[PDB]
Amino acid sequence: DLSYKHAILKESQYTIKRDVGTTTAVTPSSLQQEITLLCGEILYAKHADYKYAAEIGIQYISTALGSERVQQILRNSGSEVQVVLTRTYSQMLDIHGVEKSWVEEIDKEARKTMATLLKESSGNIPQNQRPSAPDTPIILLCVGALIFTKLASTIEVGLETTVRRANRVLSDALKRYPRMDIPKIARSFYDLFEQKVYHRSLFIEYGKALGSSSTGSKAESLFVNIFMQAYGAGQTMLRWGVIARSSNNIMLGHVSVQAELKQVTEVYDLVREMGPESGLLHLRQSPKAGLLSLANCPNFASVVLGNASGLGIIGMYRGRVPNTELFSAAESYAKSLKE
Amino acid sequence: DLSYKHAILKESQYTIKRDVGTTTAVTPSSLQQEITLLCGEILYAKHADYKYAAEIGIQYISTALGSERVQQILRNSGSEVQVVLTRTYSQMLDIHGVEKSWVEEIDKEARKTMATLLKESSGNIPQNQRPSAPDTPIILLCVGALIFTKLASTIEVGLETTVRRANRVLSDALKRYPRMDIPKIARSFYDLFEQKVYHRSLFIEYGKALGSSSTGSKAESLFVNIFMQAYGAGQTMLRWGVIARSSNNIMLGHVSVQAELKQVTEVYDLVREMGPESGLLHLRQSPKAGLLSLANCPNFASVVLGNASGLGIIGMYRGRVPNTELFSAAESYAKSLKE
RNA sequence: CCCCCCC
RNA sequence: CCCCCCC
RNA sequence: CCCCCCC
């Protein structure tokens, strides 16, 4: 059945159309040196409103890939959003859907903070501490990638995890910019990813275009590391299933587990059939996701969760254990094997 | 999963574009006999500012490979830096991005030192002690290659190691040039490698074009020796893992180590799949680096670090030991086997 | 319906 | 996130 | 870094 369902979904002669009357903003590569400034003036000043930081990160992505490539990416993502270009005025940027009041506020706040830290201090600002640093857009996109790995999770868990992991992953940027509010920027990125779902596709295309590069700075290598940490998002049950098989859990040989193993292997075969893009299904909110669910094998899922709980892997996972006896037996065996 | 991640990163139909509006300097081979002088006038005089010594070494590399080949190397490294040629004026060099005041200062300091060591002394300066010696650019690039092997490490460790190793590796040059400041030149090279990441690719291309040569002086053989000592930079955990396997550590047969051995072998298979260029991934800061991390196998990493600590190989390695009990058991077994 | 830990 | 010793 | 004896 599962192969037939995927065959129906894949073999479609008709293309969906959505967001027909909508538009979005991009910034041409000719403005990259400008957007960098903006992407850094968000980082070293303490701003009251961090509402459009995610849009500025996506603007930098658009400068990197190019306006035409970004339009093509949005078009092939199933969304008929018409790209609107970015202009300059007196210079500053007039990004579509980003209020000019916001850009002026961010620029003025950063200029005032820079003046205050230059007047009082000894005037020895290093090359990495200024807003026009060239890795500041990647530093903002690193907060974006941290909150990207938690798009399958909830908002509160995502924000808490982003802040916790960014105090260590982004320690160097925090030292360079003492006053960068990872919570508010992470909230902005979560809002962008939820509202504009095609920007998940744009962000993934940037991740690919960055990982495929021949050279990169440490910021881009960090961004790619986090982006790849997001790969199996929304499918931790499959990873824990292969973990359970590697652990040689005895309760995998139970009668009901052996009964469901056929369709479990069917799900894994479907994973292989989709191939490399299967991992990005839940990140993209591809409607085709959910063909990879193991919820139709309650006993296998309970055994997998029990094995994970025994090994300590389960952590604070919020999934359901359908069959509690199998869960407890598997947990006991996994603890015994671990000890 | 790891093979699929590498397949996504490798199979990209789009090329990244960075440093679009930026430019860099090269020196044509027709100026090599001139740049040599400069590359040696840094070595036998005591200069207040050693800021652009790395750029002068890279200029000599550009003379060696050629301006067009250097432009091609920069282009295939993922960076759209426009090469700017080097000119002469009254002769001395006007290198782009290198202030003429700096070049004049270095030349004047070297001329004054030469006059002082010729007026006071007996006037028996040998052929190797003069700035126009033809191995002086390679002597500077040897300090550059020493600090190249420490690009995965920190700045302070890199500088300390460079000075310590250069007092012995470069003893002959130090005898020839008593006043050459390995600390400041090493700092200059570290700054160049951090700022201009495409120059890592240029420096690697020089290493290849030198190792492939049919003949070479002792300076070039030393440079190639150090360059090859840099090969596995950023991946000492894989080298220590194969060391642990060679040591036949008993704790490799533990339950959790045997659990993680499958994906460990997956990482090693990915290493083989990338092939010869895998070692230069962390040296180049290739964003694709981090696919080779063994951080997702905490128990294997702890056992490997314990084995290294038992054999005395660990030295002062700053990596984390996730599971302390495995680390201590492996260290005890490794010491027992060593004794 | 699906998702949900850690890195 | 990754990296981190010695030669 | 490498090399280092004798014939």
From Swiss-Prot, chains A, B:
This is Nucleoprotein. Encapsidates the viral RNA genome by forming a left-handed helical nucleocapsid that protects the RNA from nucleases. RNA replication depends on the availability of soluble nucleoprotein. The encapsidated genomic RNA is termed the NC and serves as template for transcription and replication. Its main location: virion. One of its GO terms (cellular component) is host cell cytoplasm. InterPro entries: Pneumo_ncap. It comes from Human metapneumovirus (strain CAN97-83) (HMPV). The gene is N. GO terms for molecular function: RNA binding. It comes from the Viruses. The lineage of its organism: Viruses, Riboviria, Orthornavirae, Negarnaviricota, Haploviricotina.
